[PDB]
Design a protein around this nucleic acid. Structure first.
Lengths: 142, 38, 173, 59, 208
RNA sequence: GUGAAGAGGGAAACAACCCAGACCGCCAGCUAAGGUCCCAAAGUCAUGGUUAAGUGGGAAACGAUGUGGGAAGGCCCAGACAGCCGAGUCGGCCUGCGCGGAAGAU
RNA sequence: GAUGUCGGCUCAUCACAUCCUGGGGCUGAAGUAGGUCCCAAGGGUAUGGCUGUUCGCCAUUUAAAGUGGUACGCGAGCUGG
RNA sequence: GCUGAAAGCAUCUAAGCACGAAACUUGCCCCGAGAUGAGUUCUCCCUGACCCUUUAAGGGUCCUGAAGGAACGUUGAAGAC
């Protein structure tokens, strides 16, 4: 016999909805990445995508411990000489609240085309409403 | 102000305080006794 | 602790309302509202308020003491009130009042106008004296400090704006 | 690969891989990981039976 | 507030009774016709679209003809947009004339600059020339050095070199208004503005 | 003792350090050093303590009512220590974990 | 069985132990001018006589004429004292 | 700096409230949906019949050829092409 392997033409996927109010950033991102990759199914296959679609609501109400609201710094570089830029957690929450969760989850996924395709099944909103009522998502408690 | 690694009481009217993670000396009699550790 | 173990009496003619941590006090001179820290429990028995720590916080007693002092000041201010006095020293310096605006002349080449906040009154007995009246201790102190900031007392003569009971040292050239 | 699949299958019945293997060892079952993964994918009633056996052994 | 679209005519001077000469640029401003109004509910921002001029019928396509006919105006030579501030309103079909600048003092003017083609460093960036004698070997107007060495071993982004110069968008700020003539459709400003004779200009009230 | 003349696993990448000496095949099992939140295989295991500095994840002489543990002293319901009545207060010794001294060139 | 090297010219880029401009504490700080320490890298920071000279002395200016790293930056970009 | 306990006094800080620089984020000018996360608004054009099989986002024959674009010519205060 030879071991079973999944086939991308026949794979089931479901839609879930999650709320982020008063939750810890890293301990939420771990579960999100695990379910995006598909490690909770017995049909797991390293070179195939066997994950689910997840919606996250209330992204501007996540929580951090310690003095991280004023001391966590995000860096980046522009490509021009001297172009190093930085932002703080509070400024990020004020300007672009979804990027926090997006970056946190992106850091925890495989690096390559398959990981880039995995990332496409995450939908993050900054409020309490979404326009995916035709897909009939189910409530997931993490 | 005096910026030093060693801050001490220099007379009888000096007081040692800790503000925002810094040790300081404040005097009610002599403005020359103000000190800051750094 | 030793300050949190002395109940606060509530004289006749004042009203207290407590909802969780929000406390309101009303009296002949006005009304004041506050929100306490989440480690103190305040109890109204018959004629006094008592303060104590909850269970599960490591700094209950300090918070209890702070709450005690704050509420004592509230009670005092809702019946009697608070007053402050300011003095001016120098040649040509003067002050006047119109509505809720104080006009100061203090040796500059432009006028100085200060706008009082809600709940504070000012009057000028002489041209070189200011008296402030109110019901909120912190606000009265902040207004006095702001007024003093314009021209602080100097060490060689003592000119400027000073408190009534302040000792201002001087030295020679 | 076999170990990862067995972990996924066991956490759906309510136990973890390490405890499941310990329970099988104490129950004297000698089935290997290849066959366990095969059964996990192609037959779930039998896998539930095995998990109950392991839980009873650990109890 | 809003602005207008005009055409550049030329340059001349004005003499004042006390003996001062003022250089002026002449702008021809005809009526601007409103073609579309954009609001928050439908589009997401508040603006107007305008046209001016004329165009021969045999050079207008069907889509453009329909767009004009919906508003009920004739065909011009272009379409431009202006943003609206709170408290302003217009209606489709309206006409706006040069008397809008009756009480304005300073303006900003936007246009397209003249073209110079491929240019060198002496002219494009004001580099200094090396010596004409004293042994120079074929290096008179060349740029010189463009980097350091093994560290970093490359050229930095944004280095100044040779290439296309001119023929781009340019704005000039805070020019005085010398005259507004409504009978002849003229606006006289003081100074020089970008472009050549016969080009399109955008005029707005000063922002500073 | 190892490399030279030696492959495999660990220390991110790393001849000479730690574990261990490759005759050939297997889609079987047990362990060594090192590990069990995600990248990435395996405890978001159980009981009792310490730290608030992201210390953990660079560096001294010296300075300071940070905060745990211990063995002894002085004064005090004869009214002590603080300020202008009523329960404690003062300064040394040993010890665990933290804080300042702490400035560089894509 | 080859990694061209001192000064000069043309062109630059970074650090902060800050020369000018900005904000402060102490003074044996009356005012005007000064002394010392803390924060701060946005912009700007000379022409000539002598010498192959980097330096340096001298004459006359300027708010000021900063100290260092980049194969003691830069010869498949120039010169050859 | 204001109010304030731990520590009955005192204390800018532990809980709360207010000022403060050419450095940071904006305000001024220019590019910008290959932003593969490829977005929005207004207007214009296309309204025929048959066959085959391995029956499906299948192959072929006849009739029809819109909106618009490109090519050629006279050229430009646009341009190495």
């Amino acid at each position: 016999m030879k071991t079973f392997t999944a086939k991308p033409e026949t794979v089931k996927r479901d839609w879930y909805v999650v709320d982020a109010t008063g939750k810890t950033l890293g301990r939420l991102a771990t579960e999100l990445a695990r379910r995006l990759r598909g490690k909770h199914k017995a049909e797991y296959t390293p070179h195939v995508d066997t994950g689910d679609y997840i919606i996250v609501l209330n992204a501007d109400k996540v929580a951090v411990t310690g003095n991280k609201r004023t001391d966590k710094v995000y860096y980046h570089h522009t490509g021009h000489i001297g172009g190093i830029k930085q932002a703080t957690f509070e400024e990020m929450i004020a300007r672009r609240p979804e990027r926090v969760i997006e970056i946190a989850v992106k850091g925890m996924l495989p690096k390559g085309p398959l990981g880039r395709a995995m990332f496409r099944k995450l939908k993050v909103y900054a409020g309490n409403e979404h326009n995916h009522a035709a897909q009939q998502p189910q409530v997931l408690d993490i | 102000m005096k910026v030093r690694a060693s801050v001490k009481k220099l007379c009888r009217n000096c007081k040692i305080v800790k503000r925002d993670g810094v040790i300081r000396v404040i005097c009610s009699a002599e403005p020359k006794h103000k000190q800051r550790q750094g | 602790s030793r300050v949190a173990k002395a109940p606060v009496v509530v004289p006749a003619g004042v009203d207290v309302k407590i909802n969780g941590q929000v406390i309101t006090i009303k009296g002949k001179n006005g009304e004041l509202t506050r929100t306490l820290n989440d480690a103190v429990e305040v109890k109204h028995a018959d004629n006094t308020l008592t303060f104590g720590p909850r269970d599960g916080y490591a700094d209950g007693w300090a918070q209890a003491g702070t709450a005690r002092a704050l509420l004592n000041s509230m009670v005092i201010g809702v019946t009697e009130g608070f007053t402050k006095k300011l003095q001016l020293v120098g040649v040509g310096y003067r002050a006047a009042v119109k509505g809720n605006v104080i006009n100061l002349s203090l040796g500059f080449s432009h006028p100085v106008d200060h706008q009082l906040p809600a709940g504070i009154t000012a009057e000028c007995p002489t041209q070189t004296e200011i008296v402030l009246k109110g019901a909120d201790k912190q606000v009265i102190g902040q207004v006095a400090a702001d007024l003093r900031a314009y021209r602080r007392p100097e060490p060689y003569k003592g000119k400027g704006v000073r408190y009534a009971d302040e000792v201002v040292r001087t030295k020679e050239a | 690969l076999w170990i990862a699949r067995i972990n996924a299958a066991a956490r759906q019945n309510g136990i973890s891989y390490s405890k499941f293997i310990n329970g099988l060892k104490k129950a004297s079952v000698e089935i290997d990981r290849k066959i366990l993964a095969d059964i996990a994918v192609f037959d779930k009633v039998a896998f539930t039976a095995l998990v109950e056996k392991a839980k009873a052994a650990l109890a | 507030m809003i602005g207008l679209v005009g055409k550049k005519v030329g340059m001349t001077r004005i003499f004042t009774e006390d003996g001062v000469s003022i250089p002026v640029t002449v702008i021809e401003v005809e009526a601007n016709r409103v073609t579309q109004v954009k609001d928050l509910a439908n589009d997401g921002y508040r603006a107007i679209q305008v046209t001016t001029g004329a165009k021969k019928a045999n050079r207008v396509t069907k889509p453009e003809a329909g767009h004009f006919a919906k508003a009920g105006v004739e065909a011009g030579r272009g379409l431009w947009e202006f943003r609206l501030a709170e408290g302003e309103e217009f209606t489709v079909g309206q006409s706006i004339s040069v008397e809008l600048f009756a009480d304005v003092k300073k303006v900003d003017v936007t246009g397209t600059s003249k073209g110079k083609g491929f240019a060198g460093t002496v002219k494009r960036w004001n580099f200094r020339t090396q010596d004409a004698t004293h042994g120079n070997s074929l290096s008179h107007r060349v740029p010189g050095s463009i980097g350091q060495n093994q560290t970093p071993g490359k050229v930095f982004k944004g280095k100044k070199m040779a290439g296309q110069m001119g023929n781009e968008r340019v704005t000039v700020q805070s020019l005085d208004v010398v005259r507004v003539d409504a009978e002849r459709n003229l606006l006289l400003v003081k100074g020089a503005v970008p472009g050549a004779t016969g080009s399109d200009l955008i005029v707005k009230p000063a922002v500073k």
